[PDB]
């Protein structure tokens, strides 16, 4: 598949900003301790959970780790209004998509528990790009990244990851994302 396509660096995609080790461990633990225990079930397919403001502190504090320059530029200096928490047990993913127009520009994703791989697709350009979303990271998607490209998480139970010159198949563990957006 995709023999007509090129894989380019994620840096070539305007409006993708990635911040490894954005959340202190203390913040990650406080959030995870405070999610309903049913949400983190290891069995079958990961569950999801919509939350609407006012958010409790263990969520709401995530607003503080979204860079101010992003919120000013796109969110009117304000904080997130809609939040979705999604669990991914090994083998879970999401098909390529662009986020719904009801949200307008600037999407923040916080990652918890374990690492995964997200793939960006531009069918008109015939390009792919990939980013490793690590535990504790923040991904901001806006502009070209958010309107021009699709994103997905492949449905599989590991990812090939290149590190220190070697490539290994890193098994997936349970992963939780928190996606923070505004309604336009
Ligand atoms: O959970 C993720 O990392 C991606 C979620 C997503 O793409 C979405 O909420 O539209
Ligand atoms: Fe999305």
Curated annotation (Swiss-Prot):
Recorded superkingdom: Eukaryota
An annotated Gene Ontology molecular function: ferrous iron binding
Keywords: Cytoplasm, Iron, Nucleus, Oxidoreductase, Vitamin C
Record-annotated disulphide pairs: none
Annotated transmembrane regions: none
Coiled-coil residue spans: none
Domain Fe2OG dioxygenase: residue ranges: 79-184
Keyword Cytoplasm among UniProt keywords: yes
GO biological process, one term: DNA damage response
Cellular compartment(s): Cytoplasm; Nucleus
GO cellular component: chromatin; cytosol; mitochondrial matrix; nucleus
Principal location listed in the UniProt entry: cytoplasm
Family recorded in the similarity comment: Belongs to the iron/ascorbate-dependent oxidoreductase family.
Protein name per its UniProtKB record: Uncharacterized protein P8A3.02c
Species of origin: Schizosaccharomyces pombe (strain 972 / ATCC 24843) (Fission yeast)
């Amino acid at each position: 598949d995709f023999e007509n396509w090129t894989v380019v660096p994620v840096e070539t995609i305007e409006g993708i900003n990635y911040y490894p080790n954005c959340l202190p461990e203390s913040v990650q633990r406080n959030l995870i301790n405070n999610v309903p225990k049913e949400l983190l079930s290891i069995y079958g397919s990961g569950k999801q959970s919509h939350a609407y403001l006012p958010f409790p502190a263990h969520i709401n504090c995530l607003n503080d780790y979204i860079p101010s320059d992003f919120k000013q530029r796109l969110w009117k200096g304000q904080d997130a209004e809609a939040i979705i928490m999604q669990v991914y047990n090994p083998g879970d993913g999401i098909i390529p998509h662009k986020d719904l127009e009801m949200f307008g520009d600037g999407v923040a994703i916080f990652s918890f528990l374990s690492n995964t791989t997200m793939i960006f697709t531009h069918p008109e350009l015939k390009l792919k790009s990939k980013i490793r979303l690590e535990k504790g990271s923040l991904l901001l998607m806006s502009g070209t990244a958010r309107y021009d490209w699709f994103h997905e998480i492949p449905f599989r139970a590991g990812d090939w990851v290149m590190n220190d010159g070697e490539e290994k198949w890193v098994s997936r563990s349970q992963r939780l994302s928190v996606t923070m957006r505004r309604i336009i």
